[PDB]
């Protein structure tokens, strides 16, 4: 969708491999705030909003 009606998806109750996204070069920019991208794999969050 467009920024007027940006889609929200809620993510919970699984195992997430952020490494495959970080290494994937297809992303033009991959920039994390308040957390370093390389330490996503060993953290645990309550829920994620995409």
């Amino acid at each position: 969708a467009s920024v007027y009606a940006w889609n929200r998806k809620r993510i919970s109750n699984c195992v997430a491999d952020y490494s495959v996204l970080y290494n994937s070069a297809s992303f033009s920019t991959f920039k994390c705030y308040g957390v370093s991208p390389t330490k996503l794999n060993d953290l645990c969050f309550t829920n994620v909003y995409a």
């Binding site: 308040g34 957390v35 370093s36 390389t38 330490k39 060993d42 953290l43």
Partner: protein, 49 residues
């Protein structure tokens, strides 16, 4: 309260120790009061600040 002069020094010392311990929960502008978590979820270059 007959022995208030000796109770006061105990009270003052306990209060000072209590406030010193409770200061270990402040942020002072950081993102957390826990060293372990700002080390667990940041890298050295930005964990320094």
């Amino acid at each position: 309260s007959a022995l208030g002069k000796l109770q006061d020094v105990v009270n003052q010392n306990a209060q000072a120790l209590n406030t010193l311990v409770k200061q270990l929960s402040s942020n002072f502008g950081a993102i957390s009061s826990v060293l372990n978590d700002i080390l667990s979820r940041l890298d050295p270059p930005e964990a320094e600040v």
